């Protein structure tokens, strides 16, 4: 589930 890896990466500032 790489889609969520990206989502969480996108979550970090």
Curated annotation (Swiss-Prot):
It is found in: Cytoplasm; Cell projection. Signal peptide: none annotated. Disulfide bonds: none annotated. Widely expressed (at protein level). Coiled coil: none annotated. Phosphorylated on tyrosine residues in response to EGF and PDGF. Regulator of different signaling pathways. Regulates EPHA8 receptor tyrosine kinase signaling to control cell migration and neurite retraction. Interacts (via SAM domain) with EPHA2 (via SAM domain). Interacts with EPHA8; EPHA8 kinase activity-independent but stimulated by EPHA8 ubiquitination. Interacts (via SAM domain) with EPHA6 (via SAM domain). This is Ankyrin repeat and SAM domain-containing protein 1A. The gene is ANKS1A. The chain holds residues 745 to 757 of 1134 of the full protein.
């Amino acid at each position: 589930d790489p889609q969520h890896l990206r989502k969480l990466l996108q979550a970090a500032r």
